[PDB]
Amino acid sequence: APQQINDIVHRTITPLIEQQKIPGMAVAVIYQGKPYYFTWGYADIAKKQPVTQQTLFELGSVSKTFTGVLGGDAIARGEIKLSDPTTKYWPELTAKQWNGITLLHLATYTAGGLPLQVPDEVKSSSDLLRFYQNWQPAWAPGTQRLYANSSIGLFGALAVKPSGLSFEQAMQTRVFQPLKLNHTWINVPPAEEKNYAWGYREGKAVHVSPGALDAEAYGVKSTIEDMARWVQSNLKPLDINEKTLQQGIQLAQSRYWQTGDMYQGLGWEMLDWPVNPDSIINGSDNKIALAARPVKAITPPTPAVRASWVHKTGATGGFGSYVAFIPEKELGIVMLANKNYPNPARVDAAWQILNALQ
C-alpha cells in the first residue's frame, strides 16, 4: 500500500487491537476505488490459524445491508413495492394491527415496535406466524424507529416470496453471484470451514447459533476481500451491469426517515458528509442505536446522496464488524474482528482512518 494508508491504518488499528484484546482482525481500505488489505492475529487461537484475506467472519447485523439491497433488487424487478401492505405477501397475517404496516415499515424498523429479537422460543414456522399475529404494537406505523431483527428479517423473507426462491437462493443468485462475492455465505459450506474464524466471547470459541429469520437479519459470513468488493459495489452502483441490482443498491441508500442527524435506508444508515465525528461515534453506541426514537418521514424519500457517510455496524456473540463509505470521495473501510467490542471504538477508528485519507 501507499505509505500514508499503511501508516494511518496501522497507527489506528494496532492500539485498538491491544486496547480491546481482539484475537484477530482484518481491515480493507478502499481509496480512490482500489482496495488495500491489512490483517492481524488469529482466526483460531487453539489451532494457531492466522487471519488472512480468505478468513470468513460473521457479519452479524452488517448482513442487513445485503437484505436491504436484495429487497431493492426485488423492487427493481417489479416483484414487490415498499408501499405494499405486509398482508399482501403474508395473507395469513389477519390480525387488525397489521392494517397499515407496509414493507417499508418492516425494512426500516418503523412498524410500531417489533422487538429486537425474534423470541428464541420461536422454533417452527407456525410459531413464527403466532408470534407476528399476537404481537401488539406500542405505536402507530411510521412514527417511531426501534431497531429490530424481527422487522427487517420479516421484510427479507417477504421480499423474496414472489420470486419463489428461498431467501438464500435469491441472495446467492441475485446479489452474491453478479457481484463476484464467491466467498460470501449464508451457510458456510464444508469446503470453506478451514477458513471460518472462531468468534471469541469471554475467552470461549463460539459461532452464531441457528435462529428464526437468521439468514435475513444477521446470517452472512464473508471475507475481507468480498467485503471490500461489497463496498466498491455500493460506492459505484452504476458500474454494476445487472440493471435491477444497480437499482437495488441505489434504493437501499435512499433516505426514508430521519432521526437526529441520521437517515434510515434499507439496511444502510446514512449521515450527511462532512459529519460531526462525535455524531457518528457516540450515535453508534447501542444505547443510542437500539433506543426508541421518533422519526420524521422523508416525503418522498431522497435518492442516494453521494455526499454521505454511509455505514453499518454489526455483531454476533463472537464477532464485531463495521463498514463505512463516502460515495463522493470514492473512499471506504471494512473492519472485521472475531470479538464483539464496543461500537464507538469501531466508528472512532474508521473515522480516524477515513478522515486522514479524505
Side-chain angles (χ1 to χ4, degrees), residues 67 86-87 89-90 93 98 101-103 106-107 111 114 118 128-129 131-132 135 148-161 167 212-213 216-217:
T67 301
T86 298
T87 55
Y89 303 97
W90 205 0
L93 223 48
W98 286 94
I101 298 175
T102 65
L103 294 186
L106 293 181
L114 284 170
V118 177
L128 192 68
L129 175 58
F131 163 69
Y132 285 107
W135 163 75
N149 287 333
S150 68
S151 192
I152 192 174
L154 182 58
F155 170 75
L158 297 183
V160 300
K161 241 47 159 171
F167 185 81
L213 297 174
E216 293 86 352

PDB file of all heavy atoms in Angstrom, residues 67 86-87 89-90 93 98 101-103 106-107 111 114 118 128-129 131-132 135 148-161 167 212-213 216-217:
ATOM      1  N   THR A  67     -29.559  -7.790   2.846  1.00  0.00           N
ATOM      2  CA  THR A  67     -31.026  -7.894   2.844  1.00  0.00           C
ATOM      3  C   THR A  67     -31.677  -6.675   2.182  1.00  0.00           C
ATOM      4  O   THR A  67     -32.582  -6.796   1.356  1.00  0.00           O
ATOM      5  CB  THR A  67     -31.528  -8.111   4.242  1.00  0.00           C
ATOM      6  OG1 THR A  67     -30.930  -9.311   4.720  1.00  0.00           O
ATOM      7  CG2 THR A  67     -33.044  -8.261   4.288  1.00  0.00           C
ATOM      8  N   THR A  86     -47.935  -5.384   4.268  1.00  0.00           N
ATOM      9  CA  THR A  86     -47.326  -6.652   4.635  1.00  0.00           C
ATOM     10  C   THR A  86     -48.244  -7.835   4.285  1.00  0.00           C
ATOM     11  O   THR A  86     -47.789  -8.874   3.800  1.00  0.00           O
ATOM     12  CB  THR A  86     -47.013  -6.667   6.134  1.00  0.00           C
ATOM     13  OG1 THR A  86     -46.077  -5.622   6.424  1.00  0.00           O
ATOM     14  CG2 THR A  86     -46.424  -7.978   6.557  1.00  0.00           C
ATOM     15  N   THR A  87     -49.537  -7.654   4.529  1.00  0.00           N
ATOM     16  CA  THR A  87     -50.514  -8.725   4.327  1.00  0.00           C
ATOM     17  C   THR A  87     -50.647  -9.183   2.872  1.00  0.00           C
ATOM     18  O   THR A  87     -51.154 -10.274   2.616  1.00  0.00           O
ATOM     19  CB  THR A  87     -51.889  -8.310   4.835  1.00  0.00           C
ATOM     20  OG1 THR A  87     -52.265  -7.082   4.205  1.00  0.00           O
ATOM     21  CG2 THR A  87     -51.842  -8.094   6.333  1.00  0.00           C
ATOM     22  N   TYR A  89     -48.242 -10.079   1.045  1.00  0.00           N
ATOM     23  CA  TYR A  89     -47.298 -11.171   0.895  1.00  0.00           C
ATOM     24  C   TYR A  89     -47.452 -12.250   1.950  1.00  0.00           C
ATOM     25  O   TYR A  89     -46.894 -13.340   1.807  1.00  0.00           O
ATOM     26  CB  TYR A  89     -45.875 -10.598   0.884  1.00  0.00           C
ATOM     27  CG  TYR A  89     -45.749  -9.592  -0.225  1.00  0.00           C
ATOM     28  CD1 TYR A  89     -45.881  -8.234   0.018  1.00  0.00           C
ATOM     29  CD2 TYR A  89     -45.617 -10.010  -1.538  1.00  0.00           C
ATOM     30  CE1 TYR A  89     -45.809  -7.317  -1.015  1.00  0.00           C
ATOM     31  CE2 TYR A  89     -45.546  -9.105  -2.575  1.00  0.00           C
ATOM     32  CZ  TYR A  89     -45.635  -7.764  -2.309  1.00  0.00           C
ATOM     33  OH  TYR A  89     -45.571  -6.872  -3.349  1.00  0.00           O
ATOM     34  N   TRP A  90     -48.201 -11.944   3.011  1.00  0.00           N
ATOM     35  CA  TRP A  90     -48.476 -12.908   4.060  1.00  0.00           C
ATOM     36  C   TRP A  90     -49.945 -12.744   4.433  1.00  0.00           C
ATOM     37  O   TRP A  90     -50.272 -12.122   5.436  1.00  0.00           O
ATOM     38  CB  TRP A  90     -47.589 -12.657   5.289  1.00  0.00           C
ATOM     39  CG  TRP A  90     -47.374 -13.893   6.136  1.00  0.00           C
ATOM     40  CD1 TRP A  90     -47.884 -15.143   5.898  1.00  0.00           C
ATOM     41  CD2 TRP A  90     -46.578 -14.007   7.326  1.00  0.00           C
ATOM     42  NE1 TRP A  90     -47.473 -16.015   6.878  1.00  0.00           N
ATOM     43  CE2 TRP A  90     -46.664 -15.348   7.761  1.00  0.00           C
ATOM     44  CE3 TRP A  90     -45.824 -13.100   8.078  1.00  0.00           C
ATOM     45  CZ2 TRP A  90     -46.014 -15.808   8.915  1.00  0.00           C
ATOM     46  CZ3 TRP A  90     -45.153 -13.561   9.208  1.00  0.00           C
ATOM     47  CH2 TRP A  90     -45.253 -14.906   9.615  1.00  0.00           C
ATOM     48  N   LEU A  93     -51.568 -13.235   7.887  1.00  0.00           N
ATOM     49  CA  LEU A  93     -51.437 -12.185   8.879  1.00  0.00           C
ATOM     50  C   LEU A  93     -52.726 -11.373   8.939  1.00  0.00           C
ATOM     51  O   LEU A  93     -52.797 -10.257   8.434  1.00  0.00           O
ATOM     52  CB  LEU A  93     -50.285 -11.277   8.491  1.00  0.00           C
ATOM     53  CG  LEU A  93     -49.328 -10.830   9.560  1.00  0.00           C
ATOM     54  CD1 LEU A  93     -48.839 -11.989  10.425  1.00  0.00           C
ATOM     55  CD2 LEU A  93     -48.170 -10.113   8.858  1.00  0.00           C
ATOM     56  N   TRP A  98     -52.106  -5.241  11.816  1.00  0.00           N
ATOM     57  CA  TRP A  98     -51.270  -5.254  10.626  1.00  0.00           C
ATOM     58  C   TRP A  98     -51.760  -4.315   9.551  1.00  0.00           C
ATOM     59  O   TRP A  98     -51.016  -3.986   8.618  1.00  0.00           O
ATOM     60  CB  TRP A  98     -51.046  -6.684  10.116  1.00  0.00           C
ATOM     61  CG  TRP A  98     -50.080  -7.399  11.020  1.00  0.00           C
ATOM     62  CD1 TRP A  98     -50.388  -8.193  12.085  1.00  0.00           C
ATOM     63  CD2 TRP A  98     -48.647  -7.306  10.983  1.00  0.00           C
ATOM     64  NE1 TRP A  98     -49.233  -8.630  12.708  1.00  0.00           N
ATOM     65  CE2 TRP A  98     -48.151  -8.101  12.042  1.00  0.00           C
ATOM     66  CE3 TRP A  98     -47.736  -6.644  10.140  1.00  0.00           C
ATOM     67  CZ2 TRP A  98     -46.789  -8.250  12.289  1.00  0.00           C
ATOM     68  CZ3 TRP A  98     -46.374  -6.808  10.376  1.00  0.00           C
ATOM     69  CH2 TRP A  98     -45.920  -7.600  11.449  1.00  0.00           C
ATOM     70  N   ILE A 101     -49.436  -1.474   8.084  1.00  0.00           N
ATOM     71  CA  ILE A 101     -47.992  -1.770   8.162  1.00  0.00           C
ATOM     72  C   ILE A 101     -47.495  -2.244   6.799  1.00  0.00           C
ATOM     73  O   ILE A 101     -47.888  -3.310   6.318  1.00  0.00           O
ATOM     74  CB  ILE A 101     -47.675  -2.816   9.235  1.00  0.00           C
ATOM     75  CG1 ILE A 101     -48.075  -2.275  10.613  1.00  0.00           C
ATOM     76  CG2 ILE A 101     -46.166  -3.093   9.248  1.00  0.00           C
ATOM     77  CD1 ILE A 101     -47.919  -3.267  11.775  1.00  0.00           C
ATOM     78  N   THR A 102     -46.622  -1.452   6.198  1.00  0.00           N
ATOM     79  CA  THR A 102     -46.122  -1.742   4.862  1.00  0.00           C
ATOM     80  C   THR A 102     -44.736  -2.402   4.884  1.00  0.00           C
ATOM     81  O   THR A 102     -44.068  -2.487   5.934  1.00  0.00           O
ATOM     82  CB  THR A 102     -45.992  -0.470   4.021  1.00  0.00           C
ATOM     83  OG1 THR A 102     -44.997   0.370   4.618  1.00  0.00           O
ATOM     84  CG2 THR A 102     -47.325   0.270   3.942  1.00  0.00           C
ATOM     85  N   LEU A 103     -44.298  -2.885   3.725  1.00  0.00           N
ATOM     86  CA  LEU A 103     -42.948  -3.421   3.618  1.00  0.00           C
ATOM     87  C   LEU A 103     -41.925  -2.358   4.015  1.00  0.00           C
ATOM     88  O   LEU A 103     -40.902  -2.697   4.602  1.00  0.00           O
ATOM     89  CB  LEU A 103     -42.663  -3.984   2.223  1.00  0.00           C
ATOM     90  CG  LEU A 103     -43.452  -5.222   1.792  1.00  0.00           C
ATOM     91  CD1 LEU A 103     -42.932  -5.724   0.434  1.00  0.00           C
ATOM     92  CD2 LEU A 103     -43.445  -6.331   2.869  1.00  0.00           C
ATOM     93  N   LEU A 106     -41.455  -2.432   7.725  1.00  0.00           N
ATOM     94  CA  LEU A 106     -40.664  -3.586   8.143  1.00  0.00           C
ATOM     95  C   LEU A 106     -39.174  -3.360   7.861  1.00  0.00           C
ATOM     96  O   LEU A 106     -38.317  -3.616   8.716  1.00  0.00           O
ATOM     97  CB  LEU A 106     -41.137  -4.857   7.427  1.00  0.00           C
ATOM     98  CG  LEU A 106     -42.544  -5.362   7.782  1.00  0.00           C
ATOM     99  CD1 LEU A 106     -42.815  -6.628   7.006  1.00  0.00           C
ATOM    100  CD2 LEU A 106     -42.680  -5.639   9.283  1.00  0.00           C
ATOM    101  N   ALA A 107     -38.872  -2.890   6.657  1.00  0.00           N
ATOM    102  CA  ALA A 107     -37.477  -2.714   6.241  1.00  0.00           C
ATOM    103  C   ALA A 107     -36.716  -1.690   7.086  1.00  0.00           C
ATOM    104  O   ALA A 107     -35.479  -1.778   7.187  1.00  0.00           O
ATOM    105  CB  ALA A 107     -37.422  -2.313   4.778  1.00  0.00           C
ATOM    106  N   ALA A 111     -42.386  -0.229  12.051  1.00  0.00           N
ATOM    107  CA  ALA A 111     -43.723  -0.854  12.056  1.00  0.00           C
ATOM    108  C   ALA A 111     -44.525  -0.556  13.324  1.00  0.00           C
ATOM    109  O   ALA A 111     -45.728  -0.770  13.356  1.00  0.00           O
ATOM    110  CB  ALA A 111     -43.596  -2.349  11.872  1.00  0.00           C
ATOM    111  N   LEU A 114     -41.910  -3.636  16.703  1.00  0.00           N
ATOM    112  CA  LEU A 114     -41.487  -5.034  16.608  1.00  0.00           C
ATOM    113  C   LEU A 114     -40.185  -5.204  17.415  1.00  0.00           C
ATOM    114  O   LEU A 114     -39.350  -4.305  17.436  1.00  0.00           O
ATOM    115  CB  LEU A 114     -41.249  -5.431  15.158  1.00  0.00           C
ATOM    116  CG  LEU A 114     -42.523  -5.680  14.336  1.00  0.00           C
ATOM    117  CD1 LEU A 114     -42.169  -5.821  12.858  1.00  0.00           C
ATOM    118  CD2 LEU A 114     -43.186  -6.967  14.832  1.00  0.00           C
ATOM    119  N   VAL A 118     -36.430 -12.009  17.426  1.00  0.00           N
ATOM    120  CA  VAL A 118     -37.487 -12.985  17.415  1.00  0.00           C
ATOM    121  C   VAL A 118     -37.222 -13.869  18.636  1.00  0.00           C
ATOM    122  O   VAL A 118     -36.075 -14.253  18.886  1.00  0.00           O
ATOM    123  CB  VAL A 118     -37.451 -13.839  16.128  1.00  0.00           C
ATOM    124  CG1 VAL A 118     -38.549 -14.917  16.169  1.00  0.00           C
ATOM    125  CG2 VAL A 118     -37.567 -12.974  14.884  1.00  0.00           C
ATOM    126  N   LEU A 128     -43.769 -18.847  14.264  1.00  0.00           N
ATOM    127  CA  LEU A 128     -43.460 -17.524  13.738  1.00  0.00           C
ATOM    128  C   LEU A 128     -44.746 -16.775  13.355  1.00  0.00           C
ATOM    129  O   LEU A 128     -44.888 -15.580  13.616  1.00  0.00           O
ATOM    130  CB  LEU A 128     -42.488 -17.639  12.553  1.00  0.00           C
ATOM    131  CG  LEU A 128     -41.807 -16.367  12.032  1.00  0.00           C
ATOM    132  CD1 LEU A 128     -40.815 -15.797  13.051  1.00  0.00           C
ATOM    133  CD2 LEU A 128     -41.125 -16.638  10.680  1.00  0.00           C
ATOM    134  N   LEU A 129     -45.701 -17.494  12.766  1.00  0.00           N
ATOM    135  CA  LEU A 129     -46.984 -16.891  12.448  1.00  0.00           C
ATOM    136  C   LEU A 129     -47.671 -16.428  13.719  1.00  0.00           C
ATOM    137  O   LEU A 129     -48.157 -15.292  13.769  1.00  0.00           O
ATOM    138  CB  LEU A 129     -47.888 -17.850  11.663  1.00  0.00           C
ATOM    139  CG  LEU A 129     -49.290 -17.297  11.406  1.00  0.00           C
ATOM    140  CD1 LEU A 129     -49.255 -15.967  10.643  1.00  0.00           C
ATOM    141  CD2 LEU A 129     -50.111 -18.297  10.629  1.00  0.00           C
ATOM    142  N   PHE A 131     -46.345 -15.668  16.577  1.00  0.00           N
ATOM    143  CA  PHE A 131     -45.590 -14.533  17.115  1.00  0.00           C
ATOM    144  C   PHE A 131     -46.041 -13.192  16.464  1.00  0.00           C
ATOM    145  O   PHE A 131     -46.360 -12.213  17.175  1.00  0.00           O
ATOM    146  CB  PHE A 131     -44.079 -14.786  16.959  1.00  0.00           C
ATOM    147  CG  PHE A 131     -43.250 -13.558  17.108  1.00  0.00           C
ATOM    148  CD1 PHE A 131     -43.123 -12.934  18.339  1.00  0.00           C
ATOM    149  CD2 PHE A 131     -42.626 -13.009  16.009  1.00  0.00           C
ATOM    150  CE1 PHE A 131     -42.355 -11.793  18.463  1.00  0.00           C
ATOM    151  CE2 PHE A 131     -41.863 -11.866  16.126  1.00  0.00           C
ATOM    152  CZ  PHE A 131     -41.736 -11.259  17.351  1.00  0.00           C
ATOM    153  N   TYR A 132     -46.109 -13.148  15.134  1.00  0.00           N
ATOM    154  CA  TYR A 132     -46.459 -11.886  14.465  1.00  0.00           C
ATOM    155  C   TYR A 132     -47.945 -11.568  14.618  1.00  0.00           C
ATOM    156  O   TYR A 132     -48.326 -10.404  14.759  1.00  0.00           O
ATOM    157  CB  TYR A 132     -46.054 -11.889  12.988  1.00  0.00           C
ATOM    158  CG  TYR A 132     -44.549 -11.726  12.792  1.00  0.00           C
ATOM    159  CD1 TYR A 132     -43.761 -12.801  12.390  1.00  0.00           C
ATOM    160  CD2 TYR A 132     -43.927 -10.502  13.031  1.00  0.00           C
ATOM    161  CE1 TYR A 132     -42.398 -12.682  12.219  1.00  0.00           C
ATOM    162  CE2 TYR A 132     -42.544 -10.365  12.849  1.00  0.00           C
ATOM    163  CZ  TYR A 132     -41.794 -11.462  12.448  1.00  0.00           C
ATOM    164  OH  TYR A 132     -40.427 -11.343  12.290  1.00  0.00           O
ATOM    165  N   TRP A 135     -48.341 -10.209  18.255  1.00  0.00           N
ATOM    166  CA  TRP A 135     -47.571  -9.022  18.580  1.00  0.00           C
ATOM    167  C   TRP A 135     -48.460  -7.777  18.630  1.00  0.00           C
ATOM    168  O   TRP A 135     -49.218  -7.504  17.693  1.00  0.00           O
ATOM    169  CB  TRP A 135     -46.446  -8.841  17.554  1.00  0.00           C
ATOM    170  CG  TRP A 135     -45.875  -7.457  17.556  1.00  0.00           C
ATOM    171  CD1 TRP A 135     -45.034  -6.921  18.490  1.00  0.00           C
ATOM    172  CD2 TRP A 135     -46.111  -6.431  16.586  1.00  0.00           C
ATOM    173  NE1 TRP A 135     -44.720  -5.619  18.154  1.00  0.00           N
ATOM    174  CE2 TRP A 135     -45.369  -5.295  16.986  1.00  0.00           C
ATOM    175  CE3 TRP A 135     -46.850  -6.376  15.398  1.00  0.00           C
ATOM    176  CZ2 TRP A 135     -45.357  -4.114  16.253  1.00  0.00           C
ATOM    177  CZ3 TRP A 135     -46.824  -5.201  14.651  1.00  0.00           C
ATOM    178  CH2 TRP A 135     -46.084  -4.084  15.085  1.00  0.00           C
ATOM    179  N   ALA A 148     -34.706  -3.596  14.981  1.00  0.00           N
ATOM    180  CA  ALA A 148     -35.340  -4.899  15.193  1.00  0.00           C
ATOM    181  C   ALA A 148     -35.015  -5.917  14.116  1.00  0.00           C
ATOM    182  O   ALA A 148     -35.357  -5.736  12.940  1.00  0.00           O
ATOM    183  CB  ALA A 148     -36.853  -4.731  15.312  1.00  0.00           C
ATOM    184  N   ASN A 149     -34.439  -7.044  14.526  1.00  0.00           N
ATOM    185  CA  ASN A 149     -34.232  -8.162  13.618  1.00  0.00           C
ATOM    186  C   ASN A 149     -35.570  -8.746  13.181  1.00  0.00           C
ATOM    187  O   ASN A 149     -35.702  -9.236  12.060  1.00  0.00           O
ATOM    188  CB  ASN A 149     -33.422  -9.255  14.295  1.00  0.00           C
ATOM    189  CG  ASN A 149     -31.980  -8.886  14.457  1.00  0.00           C
ATOM    190  OD1 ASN A 149     -31.454  -8.112  13.689  1.00  0.00           O
ATOM    191  ND2 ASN A 149     -31.319  -9.485  15.435  1.00  0.00           N
ATOM    192  N   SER A 150     -36.584  -8.675  14.045  1.00  0.00           N
ATOM    193  CA  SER A 150     -37.887  -9.236  13.690  1.00  0.00           C
ATOM    194  C   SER A 150     -38.584  -8.404  12.621  1.00  0.00           C
ATOM    195  O   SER A 150     -39.528  -8.865  11.982  1.00  0.00           O
ATOM    196  CB  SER A 150     -38.781  -9.373  14.922  1.00  0.00           C
ATOM    197  OG  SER A 150     -39.159  -8.100  15.430  1.00  0.00           O
ATOM    198  N   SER A 151     -38.102  -7.181  12.427  1.00  0.00           N
ATOM    199  CA  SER A 151     -38.698  -6.261  11.460  1.00  0.00           C
ATOM    200  C   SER A 151     -38.018  -6.475  10.098  1.00  0.00           C
ATOM    201  O   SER A 151     -38.629  -6.931   9.137  1.00  0.00           O
ATOM    202  CB  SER A 151     -38.516  -4.819  11.953  1.00  0.00           C
ATOM    203  OG  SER A 151     -39.295  -3.908  11.199  1.00  0.00           O
ATOM    204  N   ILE A 152     -36.728  -6.176  10.002  1.00  0.00           N
ATOM    205  CA  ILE A 152     -36.052  -6.338   8.715  1.00  0.00           C
ATOM    206  C   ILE A 152     -35.936  -7.805   8.299  1.00  0.00           C
ATOM    207  O   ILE A 152     -35.931  -8.129   7.087  1.00  0.00           O
ATOM    208  CB  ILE A 152     -34.706  -5.607   8.669  1.00  0.00           C
ATOM    209  CG1 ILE A 152     -34.187  -5.563   7.205  1.00  0.00           C
ATOM    210  CG2 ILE A 152     -33.695  -6.299   9.629  1.00  0.00           C
ATOM    211  CD1 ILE A 152     -32.925  -4.736   7.013  1.00  0.00           C
ATOM    212  N   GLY A 153     -35.918  -8.703   9.282  1.00  0.00           N
ATOM    213  CA  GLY A 153     -35.909 -10.130   8.971  1.00  0.00           C
ATOM    214  C   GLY A 153     -37.169 -10.560   8.223  1.00  0.00           C
ATOM    215  O   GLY A 153     -37.111 -11.290   7.219  1.00  0.00           O
ATOM    216  N   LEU A 154     -38.318 -10.094   8.692  1.00  0.00           N
ATOM    217  CA  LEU A 154     -39.575 -10.397   8.016  1.00  0.00           C
ATOM    218  C   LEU A 154     -39.611  -9.743   6.638  1.00  0.00           C
ATOM    219  O   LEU A 154     -40.052 -10.367   5.668  1.00  0.00           O
ATOM    220  CB  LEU A 154     -40.770  -9.964   8.867  1.00  0.00           C
ATOM    221  CG  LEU A 154     -42.127 -10.302   8.235  1.00  0.00           C
ATOM    222  CD1 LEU A 154     -42.214 -11.810   7.981  1.00  0.00           C
ATOM    223  CD2 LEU A 154     -43.255  -9.845   9.172  1.00  0.00           C
ATOM    224  N   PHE A 155     -39.112  -8.502   6.545  1.00  0.00           N
ATOM    225  CA  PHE A 155     -39.005  -7.838   5.245  1.00  0.00           C
ATOM    226  C   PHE A 155     -38.244  -8.725   4.249  1.00  0.00           C
ATOM    227  O   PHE A 155     -38.681  -8.903   3.113  1.00  0.00           O
ATOM    228  CB  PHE A 155     -38.301  -6.468   5.362  1.00  0.00           C
ATOM    229  CG  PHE A 155     -37.950  -5.862   4.036  1.00  0.00           C
ATOM    230  CD1 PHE A 155     -38.937  -5.297   3.237  1.00  0.00           C
ATOM    231  CD2 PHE A 155     -36.632  -5.846   3.580  1.00  0.00           C
ATOM    232  CE1 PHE A 155     -38.632  -4.766   1.998  1.00  0.00           C
ATOM    233  CE2 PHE A 155     -36.312  -5.316   2.348  1.00  0.00           C
ATOM    234  CZ  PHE A 155     -37.305  -4.755   1.552  1.00  0.00           C
ATOM    235  N   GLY A 156     -37.082  -9.250   4.661  1.00  0.00           N
ATOM    236  CA  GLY A 156     -36.268 -10.076   3.769  1.00  0.00           C
ATOM    237  C   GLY A 156     -37.020 -11.323   3.323  1.00  0.00           C
ATOM    238  O   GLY A 156     -37.000 -11.691   2.141  1.00  0.00           O
ATOM    239  N   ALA A 157     -37.715 -11.967   4.262  1.00  0.00           N
ATOM    240  CA  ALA A 157     -38.451 -13.201   3.933  1.00  0.00           C
ATOM    241  C   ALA A 157     -39.591 -12.913   2.949  1.00  0.00           C
ATOM    242  O   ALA A 157     -39.831 -13.698   2.021  1.00  0.00           O
ATOM    243  CB  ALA A 157     -38.988 -13.872   5.184  1.00  0.00           C
ATOM    244  N   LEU A 158     -40.304 -11.809   3.154  1.00  0.00           N
ATOM    245  CA  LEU A 158     -41.430 -11.473   2.277  1.00  0.00           C
ATOM    246  C   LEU A 158     -40.937 -10.950   0.926  1.00  0.00           C
ATOM    247  O   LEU A 158     -41.571 -11.195  -0.110  1.00  0.00           O
ATOM    248  CB  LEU A 158     -42.341 -10.449   2.945  1.00  0.00           C
ATOM    249  CG  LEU A 158     -43.010 -10.920   4.237  1.00  0.00           C
ATOM    250  CD1 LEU A 158     -43.948  -9.852   4.789  1.00  0.00           C
ATOM    251  CD2 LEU A 158     -43.737 -12.265   4.044  1.00  0.00           C
ATOM    252  N   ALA A 159     -39.805 -10.241   0.917  1.00  0.00           N
ATOM    253  CA  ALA A 159     -39.308  -9.634  -0.328  1.00  0.00           C
ATOM    254  C   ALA A 159     -39.031 -10.677  -1.406  1.00  0.00           C
ATOM    255  O   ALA A 159     -39.177 -10.390  -2.594  1.00  0.00           O
ATOM    256  CB  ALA A 159     -38.032  -8.833  -0.060  1.00  0.00           C
ATOM    257  N   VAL A 160     -38.633 -11.878  -0.993  1.00  0.00           N
ATOM    258  CA  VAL A 160     -38.301 -12.922  -1.962  1.00  0.00           C
ATOM    259  C   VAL A 160     -39.468 -13.860  -2.287  1.00  0.00           C
ATOM    260  O   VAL A 160     -39.325 -14.743  -3.113  1.00  0.00           O
ATOM    261  CB  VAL A 160     -37.107 -13.773  -1.512  1.00  0.00           C
ATOM    262  CG1 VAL A 160     -35.862 -12.884  -1.325  1.00  0.00           C
ATOM    263  CG2 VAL A 160     -37.431 -14.569  -0.252  1.00  0.00           C
ATOM    264  N   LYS A 161     -40.624 -13.642  -1.673  1.00  0.00           N
ATOM    265  CA  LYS A 161     -41.760 -14.539  -1.887  1.00  0.00           C
ATOM    266  C   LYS A 161     -42.185 -14.630  -3.358  1.00  0.00           C
ATOM    267  O   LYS A 161     -42.366 -15.746  -3.868  1.00  0.00           O
ATOM    268  CB  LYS A 161     -42.947 -14.133  -0.996  1.00  0.00           C
ATOM    269  CG  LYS A 161     -43.423 -15.161  -0.004  1.00  0.00           C
ATOM    270  CD  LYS A 161     -42.278 -15.773   0.754  1.00  0.00           C
ATOM    271  CE  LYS A 161     -42.760 -16.406   2.059  1.00  0.00           C
ATOM    272  NZ  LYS A 161     -41.713 -17.209   2.765  1.00  0.00           N
ATOM    273  N   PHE A 167     -34.787 -17.529   0.466  1.00  0.00           N
ATOM    274  CA  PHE A 167     -34.011 -16.325   0.696  1.00  0.00           C
ATOM    275  C   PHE A 167     -32.546 -16.526   0.291  1.00  0.00           C
ATOM    276  O   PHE A 167     -31.928 -15.664  -0.353  1.00  0.00           O
ATOM    277  CB  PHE A 167     -34.088 -15.924   2.161  1.00  0.00           C
ATOM    278  CG  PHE A 167     -33.395 -14.622   2.460  1.00  0.00           C
ATOM    279  CD1 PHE A 167     -34.024 -13.409   2.198  1.00  0.00           C
ATOM    280  CD2 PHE A 167     -32.104 -14.599   2.992  1.00  0.00           C
ATOM    281  CE1 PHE A 167     -33.383 -12.197   2.473  1.00  0.00           C
ATOM    282  CE2 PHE A 167     -31.447 -13.396   3.263  1.00  0.00           C
ATOM    283  CZ  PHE A 167     -32.088 -12.195   3.001  1.00  0.00           C
ATOM    284  N   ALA A 212     -34.691 -18.179  14.196  1.00  0.00           N
ATOM    285  CA  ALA A 212     -35.700 -17.743  13.245  1.00  0.00           C
ATOM    286  C   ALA A 212     -35.257 -16.470  12.515  1.00  0.00           C
ATOM    287  O   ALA A 212     -34.817 -15.509  13.133  1.00  0.00           O
ATOM    288  CB  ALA A 212     -37.009 -17.492  13.978  1.00  0.00           C
ATOM    289  N   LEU A 213     -35.424 -16.460  11.196  1.00  0.00           N
ATOM    290  CA  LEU A 213     -35.092 -15.297  10.375  1.00  0.00           C
ATOM    291  C   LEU A 213     -33.636 -14.884  10.537  1.00  0.00           C
ATOM    292  O   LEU A 213     -33.291 -13.710  10.356  1.00  0.00           O
ATOM    293  CB  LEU A 213     -36.059 -14.121  10.637  1.00  0.00           C
ATOM    294  CG  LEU A 213     -37.512 -14.433  10.260  1.00  0.00           C
ATOM    295  CD1 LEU A 213     -38.440 -13.285  10.680  1.00  0.00           C
ATOM    296  CD2 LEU A 213     -37.679 -14.736   8.769  1.00  0.00           C
ATOM    297  N   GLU A 216     -31.938 -13.715   7.146  1.00  0.00           N
ATOM    298  CA  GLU A 216     -32.471 -12.440   6.689  1.00  0.00           C
ATOM    299  C   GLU A 216     -31.963 -11.256   7.495  1.00  0.00           C
ATOM    300  O   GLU A 216     -31.899 -10.126   7.000  1.00  0.00           O
ATOM    301  CB  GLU A 216     -34.012 -12.495   6.738  1.00  0.00           C
ATOM    302  CG  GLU A 216     -34.618 -13.502   5.717  1.00  0.00           C
ATOM    303  CD  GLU A 216     -34.715 -14.948   6.222  1.00  0.00           C
ATOM    304  OE1 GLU A 216     -34.192 -15.273   7.312  1.00  0.00           O
ATOM    305  OE2 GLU A 216     -35.361 -15.771   5.534  1.00  0.00           O
ATOM    306  N   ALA A 217     -31.597 -11.501   8.749  1.00  0.00           N
ATOM    307  CA  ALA A 217     -31.261 -10.386   9.634  1.00  0.00           C
ATOM    308  C   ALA A 217     -29.781 -10.345  10.028  1.00  0.00           C
ATOM    309  O   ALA A 217     -29.220  -9.273  10.234  1.00  0.00           O
ATOM    310  CB  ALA A 217     -32.158 -10.417  10.880  1.00  0.00           C
TER     311      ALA A 217
END
